[PDB]
Amino acid sequence: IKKNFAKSKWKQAFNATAVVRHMRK
Amino acid sequence: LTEEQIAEFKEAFSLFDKDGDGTITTKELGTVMRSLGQNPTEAELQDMINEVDADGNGTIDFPEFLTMMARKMKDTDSEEEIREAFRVFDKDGNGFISAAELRHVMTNLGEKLTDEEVDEMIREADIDGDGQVNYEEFVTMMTS
Ligand SMILES: [Ca+2]
Ligand SMILES: [Ca+2]
Ligand SMILES: [Ca+2]
Ligand SMILES: [Ca+2]
Numbered sequence: 001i002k003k004n005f006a007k008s009k010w011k012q013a014f015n016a017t018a019v020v021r022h023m024r025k
Numbered sequence: 026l027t028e029e030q031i032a033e034f035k036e037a038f039s040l041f042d043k044d045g046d047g048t049i050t051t052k053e054l055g056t057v058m059r060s061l062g063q064n065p066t067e068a069e070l071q072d073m074i075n076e077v078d079a080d081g082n083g084t085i086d087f088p089e090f091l092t093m094m095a096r097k098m099k100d101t102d103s104e105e106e107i108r109e110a111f112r113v114f115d116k117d118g119n120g121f122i123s124a125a126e127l128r129h130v131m132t133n134l135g136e137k138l139t140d141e142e143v144d145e146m147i148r149e150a151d152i153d154g155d156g157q158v159n160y161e162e163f164v165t166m167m168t169s
Contacts (some may be wrong), residue, residue: 001141001142001145003130003149005142005145005146006122006145006148006149006150006164007148008036009136009142009147010144010146010149010150010166010167011033011036011037011167012037012039012040012169013040013109013114013130013131013134013136014144015033015036015037015040015080015121015161016037016040016041016057016134017109017110017112017113018076018097018101018106018110019037019041019093019094020054020057020058020061020063021106021109021110022093022096022097022101023054023073023076023077024058024063024069024073024095
Protein backbone atom coordinates (compact mmCIF):
# COMPACT_ATOMS: atom_id res chain seq x y z
CA ILE A 1 0.00 0.00 0.00
CA LYS A 2 1.41 3.40 -0.93
CA LYS A 3 2.28 5.84 1.82
CA ASN A 4 -0.37 8.35 0.73
CA PHE A 5 -3.27 5.90 1.00
CA ALA A 6 -4.05 6.50 4.66
CA LYS A 7 -4.39 10.28 4.61
CA SER A 8 -6.57 10.24 1.51
CA LYS A 9 -8.83 7.40 2.71
CA TRP A 10 -9.30 8.93 6.20
CA LYS A 11 -10.21 12.27 4.59
CA GLN A 12 -12.74 10.60 2.27
CA ALA A 13 -14.52 8.98 5.25
CA PHE A 14 -14.33 12.23 7.24
CA ASN A 15 -15.91 14.09 4.32
CA ALA A 16 -18.81 11.62 4.20
CA THR A 17 -19.64 12.52 7.81
CA ALA A 18 -19.15 16.22 7.16
CA VAL A 19 -21.42 16.21 4.11
CA VAL A 20 -24.23 14.41 5.94
CA ARG A 21 -23.84 16.74 8.92
CA HIS A 22 -23.96 19.82 6.71
CA MET A 23 -26.87 18.71 4.56
CA ARG A 24 -29.06 17.63 7.44
CA LYS A 25 -28.91 21.09 8.98
CA LEU B 26 -12.19 26.42 -5.25
CA THR B 27 -8.52 25.22 -5.40
CA GLU B 28 -7.66 22.27 -7.65
CA GLU B 29 -6.52 20.32 -4.58
CA GLN B 30 -9.87 20.91 -2.91
CA ILE B 31 -11.76 19.89 -6.08
CA ALA B 32 -9.79 16.63 -6.20
CA GLU B 33 -10.53 15.92 -2.51
CA PHE B 34 -14.20 16.64 -3.03
CA LYS B 35 -14.30 14.48 -6.16
CA GLU B 36 -13.03 11.63 -4.03
CA ALA B 37 -15.68 12.42 -1.40
CA PHE B 38 -18.42 12.51 -4.09
CA SER B 39 -17.35 9.05 -5.25
CA LEU B 40 -18.23 7.60 -1.85
CA PHE B 41 -21.87 8.71 -2.27
CA ASP B 42 -22.08 7.88 -5.98
CA LYS B 43 -21.65 4.12 -5.56
CA ASP B 44 -22.96 3.27 -9.02
CA GLY B 45 -20.67 5.84 -10.64
CA ASP B 46 -23.50 7.39 -12.67
CA GLY B 47 -22.40 10.88 -11.71
CA THR B 48 -25.35 11.71 -9.51
CA ILE B 49 -26.26 11.23 -5.89
CA THR B 50 -29.87 10.00 -5.38
CA THR B 51 -31.97 9.87 -2.25
CA LYS B 52 -31.25 6.15 -2.14
CA GLU B 53 -27.53 6.80 -2.20
CA LEU B 54 -27.71 9.60 0.37
CA GLY B 55 -29.95 7.50 2.59
CA THR B 56 -27.58 4.56 2.39
CA VAL B 57 -24.73 6.70 3.63
CA MET B 58 -26.78 8.37 6.36
CA ARG B 59 -28.09 5.12 7.73
CA SER B 60 -24.55 3.75 7.68
CA LEU B 61 -23.65 6.63 10.00
CA GLY B 62 -26.41 5.74 12.51
CA GLN B 63 -29.04 8.20 11.34
CA ASN B 64 -32.65 7.31 10.64
CA PRO B 65 -33.96 9.71 8.04
CA THR B 66 -37.36 9.39 6.41
CA GLU B 67 -37.78 9.48 2.65
CA ALA B 68 -39.38 12.91 3.02
CA GLU B 69 -36.33 14.13 4.90
CA LEU B 70 -33.99 12.70 2.27
CA GLN B 71 -35.86 14.43 -0.52
CA ASP B 72 -35.74 17.74 1.34
CA MET B 73 -31.97 17.34 1.88
CA ILE B 74 -31.36 16.81 -1.82
CA ASN B 75 -33.79 19.59 -2.77
CA GLU B 76 -31.74 22.12 -0.85
CA VAL B 77 -28.65 21.56 -2.99
CA ASP B 78 -30.43 20.53 -6.21
CA ALA B 79 -29.94 23.65 -8.35
CA ASP B 80 -31.55 22.24 -11.46
CA GLY B 81 -34.56 20.57 -9.85
CA ASN B 82 -33.89 17.14 -11.39
CA GLY B 83 -34.14 15.38 -8.05
CA THR B 84 -30.46 14.34 -7.75
CA ILE B 85 -27.12 15.93 -6.93
CA ASP B 86 -24.44 16.23 -9.61
CA PHE B 87 -20.77 16.98 -9.04
CA PRO B 88 -21.12 20.71 -9.81
CA GLU B 89 -24.00 20.94 -7.30
CA PHE B 90 -21.90 19.01 -4.76
CA LEU B 91 -19.04 21.46 -5.23
CA THR B 92 -21.32 24.42 -4.57
CA MET B 93 -22.48 22.65 -1.43
CA MET B 94 -18.91 22.02 -0.25
CA ALA B 95 -17.89 25.63 -0.85
CA ARG B 96 -20.86 26.68 1.27
CA LYS B 97 -19.92 24.20 4.02
CA MET B 98 -16.29 25.41 4.14
CA LYS B 99 -17.35 28.96 4.83
CA ASP B 100 -20.34 28.54 7.14
CA THR B 101 -19.51 25.54 9.20
CA ASP B 102 -17.85 25.31 12.55
CA SER B 103 -14.70 23.33 11.64
CA GLU B 104 -13.85 22.34 15.21
CA GLU B 105 -17.33 20.94 15.92
CA GLU B 106 -17.33 19.17 12.53
CA ILE B 107 -14.19 17.24 13.51
CA ARG B 108 -15.53 16.40 16.99
CA GLU B 109 -18.79 15.03 15.61
CA ALA B 110 -16.85 13.02 12.99
CA PHE B 111 -14.67 11.44 15.67
CA ARG B 112 -17.81 10.42 17.55
CA VAL B 113 -19.15 8.65 14.46
CA PHE B 114 -16.05 6.44 14.25
CA ASP B 115 -15.78 5.86 18.01
CA LYS B 116 -18.80 3.56 18.18
CA ASP B 117 -18.45 2.51 21.80
CA GLY B 118 -17.63 6.06 22.92
CA ASN B 119 -14.49 5.15 24.84
CA GLY B 120 -12.30 7.88 23.37
CA PHE B 121 -10.40 5.69 20.95
CA ILE B 122 -11.13 4.48 17.44
CA SER B 123 -10.11 0.82 17.22
CA ALA B 124 -9.26 -1.03 13.98
CA ALA B 125 -12.55 -2.90 14.37
CA GLU B 126 -14.49 0.33 14.69
CA LEU B 127 -12.76 1.80 11.66
CA ARG B 128 -13.44 -1.29 9.60
CA HIS B 129 -17.10 -1.32 10.68
CA VAL B 130 -17.56 2.33 9.60
CA MET B 131 -15.77 1.86 6.31
CA THR B 132 -17.77 -1.34 5.56
CA ASN B 133 -20.98 0.48 6.33
CA LEU B 134 -19.85 3.25 3.96
CA GLY B 135 -19.56 0.52 1.33
CA GLU B 136 -15.78 0.48 1.37
CA LYS B 137 -14.86 -3.17 1.88
CA LEU B 138 -11.30 -2.56 2.99
CA THR B 139 -8.78 -5.37 2.91
CA ASP B 140 -7.00 -6.36 6.08
CA GLU B 141 -3.86 -4.59 4.82
CA GLU B 142 -5.79 -1.41 4.06
CA VAL B 143 -7.27 -1.20 7.57
CA ASP B 144 -3.86 -1.82 9.16
CA GLU B 145 -2.32 0.96 7.09
CA MET B 146 -5.01 3.47 8.10
CA ILE B 147 -4.51 2.70 11.77
CA ARG B 148 -0.69 2.63 11.63
CA GLU B 149 -0.51 5.96 9.89
CA ALA B 150 -2.86 7.73 12.29
CA ASP B 151 -1.45 6.06 15.40
CA ILE B 152 1.33 8.51 16.42
CA ASP B 153 1.68 7.20 19.98
CA GLY B 154 1.85 3.51 19.04
CA ASP B 155 -0.95 2.15 21.22
CA GLY B 156 -2.66 0.54 18.22
CA GLN B 157 -5.69 2.82 18.22
CA VAL B 158 -6.58 6.34 17.27
CA ASN B 159 -7.24 8.95 19.89
CA TYR B 160 -8.81 12.36 19.32
CA GLU B 161 -5.55 14.27 18.94
CA GLU B 162 -4.31 11.71 16.42
CA PHE B 163 -7.60 11.98 14.51
CA VAL B 164 -7.37 15.77 14.44
CA THR B 165 -3.81 15.62 13.19
CA MET B 166 -4.78 13.14 10.48
CA MET B 167 -7.56 15.41 9.22
CA THR B 168 -5.90 18.84 9.45
CA SER B 169 -2.27 18.31 8.49
CA1 LIG C 1 -25.35 7.53 -8.48
CA1 LIG D 1 -29.55 18.28 -9.77
CA1 LIG E 1 -13.95 3.13 20.64
CA1 LIG F 1 -2.72 5.98 19.35
